[PDB]
Each structure stands twice: as C-alpha cells, then as structure tokens.
Amino acid sequence: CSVDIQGNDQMQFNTNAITVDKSCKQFTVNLSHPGNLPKNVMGHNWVLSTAADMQGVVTDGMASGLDKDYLKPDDSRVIAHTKLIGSGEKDSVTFDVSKLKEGEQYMFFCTPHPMKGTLTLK
Template sequence: MHTTLRNTAAVLLTALLAGPALAATCDVEIEGNDAMQFNKQSIAVPASCKQFTVKLKHAGKLPKTAMGHNWVLTKAADAQAVATDGIAAGADKAYVKAGDARVIAHTKLIGGGEADSVGFDVAKLKAGEAYAWFCSFPGHSSLMKGTLTLAK
C-alpha cells in the first residue's frame, strides 16, 4: 500500500513540476545595448499562443538620439525595404513608415535604461513563412536582427 501511494505521489509531483515547463510561453524579453547588439538572434512563437508580447529593454546608457533601439517585425522578404523606408520616416516616427502594412509589429524607439513592449496577434503569422525582426535606427539593421518562426 505504501509503495503504491508513494508512486502515485511521485507521479503527481512530476506532473505538477512539468506542467509549467510544458506550458507555452507567450512572451520574450530582448535586450539591446550600446554596442549595437541584441542578446537574442531567434524567437520561436508557440502556435498555441493567441497573443505574443516582445519586451524590449535598452541595457546601455546612451540616449535614443545617439543609440536608440526599437524592435520591428516583418516577413523576411520585406525587412530591407521596411528598414530603408523607416530611415526616411525619421526619429519622431520611431524609424517606421506610418501605416506600413508590411510591419507586423514594432516597439517605440528607446534609449539607455528605457523599455517598451509590443504585442501582436499570432494569427498574423503563417507556418512555414520566414519572418525577420530588426532595429530600424539608421545603420543598425545590418547588425541588430534576428529571425522569428511559428512553432508547433
């Protein structure tokens, strides 16, 4: 009897501990710094999430006028054109062209010590599509970029 009870307790404890680890995480935190680097290169968005939130943190000290960062998500095929159009949009528009339908989501432009977050509807993503994210501050997108995938 004690062995059965102990085994049942062990199974329940294992299930309780594994439960949160198996649950989909519907957000991610990314840091940018004064060396024009993000601390991640890829993000996998669980298909089970309805909304996904990206929390951007600027770990540096420089102001946004000198070393501002944002996080912009597009299809990979659109990334370069969106970054180019963003430069023309200017700092007051966070280097994102107003009303650009190619932009799935973006944060505001932040400087050292600041943070922002953006959430987007996961239904906007398609399985098998290549997505890219980047900082659209002039000159940053060639170094500060990554990929995003829709995970099963």
C-alpha cells in the same frame, strides 16, 4: 507567450532567435536597453516583418526619421513594432499570432542599426 529582449550600446540584441508556442493566440515582446546612450544616438526598436519586406521597411523607416521612431507611419509590411527606446527605457509590443502564416520567413530587426534575428512558430 512572451519574451524579454535587450539591445545594448554595442548594437547587439541579446538573442538571435525567438520561438512562439503555437498555443499562443497573442505574443508579447518586452524590449529594454542596458547601457548609457540616449535615444537620439543609440536608440533601438524591435520590428517584425517578412524577410522579403525587411529592406523596404528599413529604407522607408530611415527616410521617416527619428520622431517617427525610424518607421514609416502605417507601414502595412510591419506586422508588429515597438517604439524607439534609449538606455534605461522599456517598451512592449503585442501581436496576434494568427498573422504569422505557414511557410513564411519572419525576421525581427532594429531599423537604424544592423541588428536582426529570426522569429519562428514552434
């Protein structure tokens, strides 16, 4: 009921797709950042929302800026998020799998940089 994911200096996540076993009550994403660039220039986060909500989350996050991890505080569209990390840093986020609803399309993404993928219940 966890996955390890990396974001590198070339703005790439090392997976495009996360699958969550339906046996899981909670799920944990462990984000890391191979490379050499720091948080203020090549910081990554990992953010989960519906596909429909992603644009507003990113836009509002960029308006909130760097010290708010490029996320709007208390954004109710964000189902789960890590903090922003630079190279060498790590952050894990855990969420309740029952927040993922049948029939919905979930996406994971970084807010400052064009990086995204799918999250699906197995």
